[PDB]
């Protein structure tokens, strides 16, 4: 359940996310009819005095049975065209992403671990 | 004699018939697949079929932190940390896409809920993925692991020190001053343990179920 | 049928310059086959993807789901996900940067993954 | 020098709590001020 | 520097032989990529770094050429 | 077998190789110094020979060839 002004963690190898900054990134917009963002939802991120698109891959809110609940809200940065900003992901990613309506093949390619 | 929690009925105004009907289906699945005995705190490995992919299975290993539900809806939640990222999954025992349940290590802990492990140090939740099963002895009683974990800085997910939770597996002396402990005790509600109308005696119900389950065997 | 043999021949016909085919062990619950194809130009990439989807629709039938085309927004990387195969098409410059062959071949020994590290700190100092 | 400046920073009481988002969850790390601690130490050295 | 400098030569030989048998993929591309890896890394290396580098190559060989088909 | 055929056949395959410069592709052309080839370079040179001529040359003596005539002689006496 990510909302406007939520603080999120960039699970990626991109320099933009990796480099330490005095402020953690905050969500600015949720691309949904509702304002709530769940796994598989794009959002608009404010990073280092800049705006970038990003994708939610995990959160701390309970879901339906037999699905993984994480300890932090994890996000991945996405370019305007939709190509991933980073080249690697190390943290486990849920397998529900494969079938959900949307474009997730590109992110799945870069992710090693699936839980 | 270990009677699984789900078999015990909850109190209420429901008819007994609804429970008899549910039990018959529960026993039938147990013949097809065996459900091992375990308690909160034991480490388990569960194998389940993956729906998205075609005929490919999955395995998850973690410590059981909670047992809930009644009848065919019973659940259990087990936890582990992978690459320094904590994950929990809630499993239903009677879900038909569970291939096997393996008790890697059977043991009992001081409390019947370990949800406070979220606030403990990471080491107390990590378990080796490839750890092999340990031996068990039939002519014994289940072991009770008495470890007391250490906590991270005070801001926590819940106020575990407060008397309602009744936590007995945290080293409070290290994390809290004696002044704070007295501050917590203002929420005690001492009278609850001594009023005889809030107690649900299930000894007879437990006994009757035992023979019927054994008799059906 | 629309199998690995058919797909590679189809790619061969349409003149894919560089082709890599990687099998996937069951331990990873993603797909049986991973295929990466290089492409000269964006116009060429669109033609290659459209023909394969057209061919797949013709041969498949009965209870076989339809397949989406992804990456049309992007001008250089296109990927199509079939039931048991995954095909990625991109230009040479895009392919080398992401270096997808390395990761799947060397599952846990990839050089880029090794560069990433872990984080711990007692205090902000 | 880090340990002594930490004590002087605590002795000066100039500390800032920051919240760090980690894979295990957010934790409130404490950041003292080296600069303020150093300034107080210099005053004591200059004073008798 | 390596575990043995004969293993590096022996390891390189096996990779080329396995590539000869590669069927579906463009064998030429695989051969060129292997040479580039064998060229860039081994010119400059250290005991600890070299051991891991050759170790990763060793697993690549011992896993059906890392799944290449 | 034809020794002259072996010589030119070895010469032809070596000529096909691009990295080596055929400035002096004599029958006694050295590899470490005349052509500047490293341990990796010789192995592929051996493969360029084994591609159609040989196919059973071990590395133990392949590295010792160091010149077309030696390999010309070596393949000649093993077949
Ligand atoms: Mg309830
Ligand atoms: Mg809360």
From Swiss-Prot, chain A:
Compartment annotation: Mitochondrion
Gene Ontology MF term list: structural constituent of ribosome
Signal peptide residue numbers: none
Gene Ontology, cellular component aspect: mitochondrial inner membrane; mitochondrial large ribosomal subunit; mitochondrion
UniProt superkingdom: Eukaryota
Family, as annotated: Belongs to the universal ribosomal protein uL14 family.
Name listed for the protein in its UniProt record: Large ribosomal subunit protein uL14m
Source organism: Mus musculus (Mouse)
Gene: Mrpl14
Covered residues, full protein: 31 to 145 of 145
Curated annotation (Swiss-Prot), chain B:
Keywords for this protein: Mitochondrion, Phosphoprotein, Ribonucleoprotein, Ribosomal protein, Transit peptide
Main location: mitochondrion
Localization per Swiss-Prot or TrEMBL: Mitochondrion
GO function terms (MF aspect): structural constituent of ribosome
Coiled-coil annotated spans: none
One Gene Ontology term, aspect cellular component: mitochondrial large ribosomal subunit
Modified residues (Phosphoserine): 4
Superkingdom of origin organism: Eukaryota
GO biological process, one term: mitochondrial translation
Family per record: Belongs to the bacterial ribosomal protein bL19 family.
Subunit: Component of the mitochondrial ribosome large subunit (39S) which comprises a 16S rRNA and about 50 distinct proteins.
Name of this chain's protein: Large ribosomal subunit protein bL19m
Organism of this sequence: Mus musculus
UniProtKB/Swiss-Prot annotation, chain C:
Cystine pairs: none
GO molecular function, one term: mitochondrial large ribosomal subunit binding
Official protein name in the record: Mitochondrial assembly of ribosomal large subunit protein 1
Known function: Required for normal mitochondrial ribosome function and mitochondrial translation. May play a role in ribosome biogenesis by preventing premature association of the 28S and 39S ribosomal subunits. Interacts with mitochondrial ribosomal protein uL14m (MRPL14), probably blocking formation of intersubunit bridge B8, preventing association of the 28S and 39S ribosomal subunits. Addition to isolated mitochondrial ribosomal subunits partially inhibits translation, probably by interfering with the association of the 28S and 39S ribosomal subunits and the formation of functional ribosomes.
Organism placement in taxonomy: Eukaryota, Metazoa, Chordata, Craniata, Vertebrata
Gene for this chain: Malsu1
Protein's organism: Mus musculus (Mouse)
Gene Ontology biological-process entries: negative regulation of mitochondrial translation; ribosomal large subunit biogenesis
One GO cellular component term noted in the UniProt record for this chain: mitochondrion
Keywords: Mitochondrion, Ribosome biogenesis
Family: Belongs to the Iojap/RsfS family.
Subcellular location: Mitochondrion matrix
Membrane-traversing stretches: none
Domain of life: Eukaryota
Swiss-Prot record, chain D:
Portion held of the full protein: 264 to 311 of 326
Subcellular location field: Mitochondrion inner membrane
Its job: Plays a role in the regulation of the mitochondrial ribosome assembly and of translational activity. Displays mitochondrial GTPase activity.
Stretches assigned to coiled coil: none
Subunit structure: Associates with the mitochondrial ribosome large subunit; the association occurs in a GTP-dependent manner.
Disulfide bridges in this chain: none
The protein's name: Mitochondrial ribosome-associated GTPase 1
Protein family (similarity comment): Belongs to the TRAFAC class YlqF/YawG GTPase family. MTG1 subfamily.
Domain of life: Eukaryota
């Amino acid at each position: 359940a990510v909302q406007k002004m939520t603080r999120v963690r960039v699970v990626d190898n991109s320099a933009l996310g990796s480099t330490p900054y005095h402020r953690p990134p905050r969500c600015i917009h949720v691309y949904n009819k509702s304002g709530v963002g769940k796994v598989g939802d794009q959002i608009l991120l404010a990073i280092r005095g800049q705006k970038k698109k990003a994708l939610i891959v995990g959160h701390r809110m309970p879901g339906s049975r037999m699905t993984p609940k994480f300890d932090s809200n994890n996000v991945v940065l996405i370019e305007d065209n939709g190509n991933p900003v980073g080249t690697r992901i190390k943290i486990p990613i849920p397998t529900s992403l494969r079938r959900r309506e949307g474009e997730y093949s590109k992110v799945l390619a870069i992710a090693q671990n699936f839980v | 004699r270990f009677l699984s929690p789900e078999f015990i009925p909850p109190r209420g105004r429901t008819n007994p018939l609804k429970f008899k009907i549910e039990r018959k289906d529960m026993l039938d699945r147990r013949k097809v697949l065996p459900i091992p005995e375990f308690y909160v705190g034991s480490i388990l490995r569960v194998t389940t079929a993956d729906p998205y992919a075609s005929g490919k299975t999955s395995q998850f290993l973690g410590i059981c932190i909670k047992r809930s539900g009644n009848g065919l809806g019973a659940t259990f939640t087990l936890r582990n940390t992978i690459e320094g990222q904590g994950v929990e999954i809630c499993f239903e025992l009677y879900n038909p896409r569970i291939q096997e349940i393996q008790v890697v290590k059977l043991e009992k802990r001081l409390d019947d809920n370990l949800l406070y492990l979220r606030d403990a140090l990471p080491e107390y939740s990590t378990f080796d993925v490839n750890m092999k099963p340990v031996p068990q002895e039939a002519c014994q009683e289940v072991p009770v692991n008495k470890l007391k974990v250490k906590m991270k800085p005070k801001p926590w997910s819940k106020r575990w020190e407060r008397p309602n939770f009744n936590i007995k597996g945290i080293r409070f002396d290290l994390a809290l001053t004696e002044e704070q402990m007295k501050e917590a005790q203002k929420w005690n509600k001492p009278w609850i343990e001594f009023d005889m109308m809030r107690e649900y005696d299930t000894s007879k119900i437990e006994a009757a179920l035992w023979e019927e389950i054994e008799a059906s065997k | 049928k629309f199998d690995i043999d058919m797909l590679v021949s189809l790619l061969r016909q349409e003149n894919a310059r560089d082709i890599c085919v990687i099998q996937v062990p069951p331990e990873m619950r993603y797909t049986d086959y991973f295929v990466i194809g290089s492409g000269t130009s964006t116009r060429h990439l669109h033609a290659m993807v459209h023909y394969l989807v057209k061919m797949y629709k013709h041969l498949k039938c009965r209870s076989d789901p339809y397949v989406k085309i992804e990456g049309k927004d992007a001008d250089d990387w296109l990927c199509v996900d079939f039931g048991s195969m995954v095909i990625h098409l991109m230009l040479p410059e895009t392919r080398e940067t992401y270096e997808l062959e390395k990761l799947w071949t060397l599952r846990s020994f990839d050089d880029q993954l090794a560069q990433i590290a872990a984080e711990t700190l007692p205090e902000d100092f | 020098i880090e340990w002594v400046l930490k004590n002087v920073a605590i002795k000066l009481r100039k500390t800032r709590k920051v919240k760090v988002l980690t894979g295990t969850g957010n934790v409130n790390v404490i950041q003292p001020d080296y600069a303020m601690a150093a300034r107080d130490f210099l005053r004591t050295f200059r004073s008798g | 520097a390596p575990w043995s400098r004969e293993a590096v030569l022996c390891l390189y030989r096996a990779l080329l032989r396995q590539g000869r048998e590669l069927r579906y993929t463009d064998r030429d591309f695989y051969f060129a990529s292997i040479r580039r890896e064998f060229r860039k890394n081994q010119k400059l290396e250290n005991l600890e770094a070299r051991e891991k580098q050759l170790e990763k190559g060793l697993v690549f060989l011992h896993s059906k050429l890392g799944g290449l088909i | 077998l034809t020794l002259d055929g072996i010589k030119d056949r070895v010469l032809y395959v070596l000529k096909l190789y691009d990295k080596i410069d055929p400035e002096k592709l004599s029958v006694n052309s050295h590899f470490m110094k005349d052509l500047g080839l490293d341990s990796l370079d010789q192995v592929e040179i051996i493969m360029a020979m084994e591609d159609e001529f040989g196919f059973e040359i071990p590395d133990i003596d392949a590295e010792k060839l160091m010149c077309p005539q030696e390999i010309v002689d070596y393949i000649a006496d093993k077949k």
